[PDB]
Design a protein around this ligand. Structure first.
Ligand code: PRO
Ligand code: PRO
Ligand SMILES: [O]
Lengths: 262, 268
């Protein structure tokens, strides 16, 4: 049996990712693959316990689901994560954010790296996320929205609340960026809400500022977000304040899935 | 502590490798690094027992095989971030070491490596199913016109596996001036009449990457200068050898197909 030889990003693609801080590959996974992933997302939402947020999200699924454990090692994903981070990689965080059709809430503006630095002791922004589109992403279903190029200022300040981790993945974020600081960013750089079909992957930088609106449409916007971190860039588990299902502690380099008879 | 971020080949370098079947990177390893590998190789030639090979005219060391399984330095070398990312890149897979060898081609007495394709041996002796494998040749010495460089038919990998005369049962003659599978002189001449011959050169510390199926050879070294090469053969994990048609020991043909991971920078 045969896995297709690993495909990496073109030099132009890499350049676009570096410039903008994000990049879309369309139709990475086919419909049958996507349906498998949706079914498993549904299992995880139904049985996740304390790993579910209210359903707003579920976290850490690759540690509990075999299908998700295999996904993060996929030859469609792992080679590009390696290429972009220029290292072996492991999964820092895994989450599925079901931005539900009628009543799907905001994600206020944030840089993931701000959270991961302060909550988990990640030392540099040498990480990225791959967001798999379980549904078509349009203007109307609350797309992920970015300031392009906004990753190249490093972190930028954000006020904190809670002496806990509970408010890290709510509508009200622990480290959001204020109206003024965003107005600045937006006035200079733009806003972009990249779009795509079911099965696409949206790659984005740990430090790019991003957000998403409420879901207007009658349509869902299920995303599977896999955060790859550089093994060299492993988080300092002695600054770590969160469970494994939010911030991994096993830094074993991932290997790609090979084709087997089962 | 920090390893330099993984460097891979440019698209132009990769196009050159696929077209010619070989590619030189100059000055990959520095002098101090080469010197560590030189000293470890001297240790393996002195302690490798059955894994050592001698030139016929003499008792002088021709080569030692399998050192990554016995030497910790060599076990780490194959995982080096100067090497592993490029092997993964060119083979478009995770990889593992099929074969490891050090070929000391001494200053006045190194003998011939007759024309051959590595893949022919690996396919028939070891059960490698396709030529999705490559060798990285580390130059422990400057490779010049005069110290018996590996010499290739550029582009000769792309007309598949050429047919060769088998000589005998088993494998001891896979490592000799007398090769088990050497090439039909009439097809050699053909290959060469249409493709030519090239002996890549470079300074100490360079790496010469070459395709598993590229016809290659080397002449004797009659310079006053050694040509020590550390040759690491990476194979794609998908392309793992069929260990059920395998005729040779571990130190010629690996059986552990665990994907290699890169060495990280630690405090020791
Ligand atoms: O707490 C976290 O790490 C994720 C990333 C930003 C939103 N929630
Ligand atoms: O026997 C082998 O496997 C190597 C490749 C060709 C010459 N010796
Ligand atoms: O060879």
């Amino acid at each position: 049996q045969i896995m297709e030889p690993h495909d990496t990003l073109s030099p132009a693609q890499v350049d676009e990712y570096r410039k903008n801080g994000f990049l879309v590959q369309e139709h990475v996974f086919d419909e049958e693959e996507i349906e498998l992933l949706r079914a498993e997302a549904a299992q995880e939402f139904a049985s996740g316990g304390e790993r579910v947020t209210v359903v707003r999200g579920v976290h850490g699924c690759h540690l509990y689901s075999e299908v998700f454990g295999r996904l993060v090692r996929s030859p469609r994903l792992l080679p590009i994560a390696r290429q972009l981070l220029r290292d072996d990689v492991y999964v820092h965080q895994f989450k599925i954010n079901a931005k539900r059709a009628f009543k799907g809430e905001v994600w206020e503006w944030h840089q993931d790296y701000t959270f991961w630095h302060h909550e988990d002791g990640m030392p540099a922004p040498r990480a990225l996320s791959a967001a798999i589109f379980l549904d078509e992403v349009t203007e109307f279903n609350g797309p992920l929205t970015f300031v392009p190029g906004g990753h190249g200022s490093g972190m930028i300040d954000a006020d904190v609340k809670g002496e806990g981790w509970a408010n890290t993945l709510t509508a009200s974020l622990k480290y959001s960026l204020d109206v003024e600081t965003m107005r600045g960013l937006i006035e200079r750089n733009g806003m972009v809400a990249p779009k795509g079909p079911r099965g696409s992957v949206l790659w984005f930088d740990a430090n790019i500022p991003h957000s998403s609106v409420p879901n207007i449409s009658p349509f869902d916007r299920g995303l599977v977000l896999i955060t790859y971190n550089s093994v060299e860039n492993k988080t300092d588990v002695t600054r770590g304040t969160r469970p494994e299902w939010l911030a991994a502690r096993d830094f074993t380099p991932l290997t790609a899935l090979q084709a087997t008879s089962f």
